[PDB]
Design a protein around this ligand. Sequence first.
Ligand SMILES: O=C(O)CNC(=O)c1nc(Cl)c2ccccc2c1O
Ligand SMILES: [Fe+2]
Length: 219
Amino acid sequence: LPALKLALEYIVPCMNKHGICVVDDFLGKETGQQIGDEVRALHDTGKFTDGQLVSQKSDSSKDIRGDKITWIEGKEPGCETIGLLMSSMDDLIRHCNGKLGSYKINGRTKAMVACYPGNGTGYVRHVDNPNGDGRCVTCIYYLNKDWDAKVSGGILRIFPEGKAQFADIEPKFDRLLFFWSDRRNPHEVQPAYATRYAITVWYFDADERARAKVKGVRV
Ligand SMILES: O=C(O)CNC(=O)c1nc(Cl)c2ccccc2c1O
Ligand SMILES: [Fe+2]
């Protein structure tokens, strides 16, 4: 699918109606697998953090850690298919622009690659941007070949604002997800019992980000 046709016929309508949009088979199997390989090489070569401190015990070799992260710009050696993913997200957003709510998207973060290590940890209920920091759209790409949540857990559960209620989204290979980053979409990651990778970029609305700057920037 040309990025523009996906954007106009699918992303924009779904985002405006539901605030959440799932695109399956985004990049296809060859590119998805190449991204998988890049992320696994990052993991195998020690490029992730040790993971979010989940249980701090006053004895510390028994601390439990959860999601590990690394920030990727997309031009690093061995990360160029991740770079390519990021470009493809950006092209999708560029084709939506002016049509997602009333936002005008003018920038994004680096990619945050996350690895839930498969030790029963997940991620607590949260809103990505609860305090007006500029981020308007969360974009997540999942990496996980043959993921079965009934065995491996790791479902993303989102609670669209005032609804009875939730949507359960499997972290499926080659699935791309968008959702509004603000309090409209509280969400959580259920415990994962197998290694679970995802790559997230957040897009900034120009007006929100400009006044967030207000609330060394000193001349
Ligand atoms: O991975 C998923 O399906 C959903 N993940 C998250 O919502 C998520 N959100 C945030 Cl804000 C962080 C923030 C830091 C590290 C990992 C995160 C994460 O997995
Ligand atoms: Fe989140």
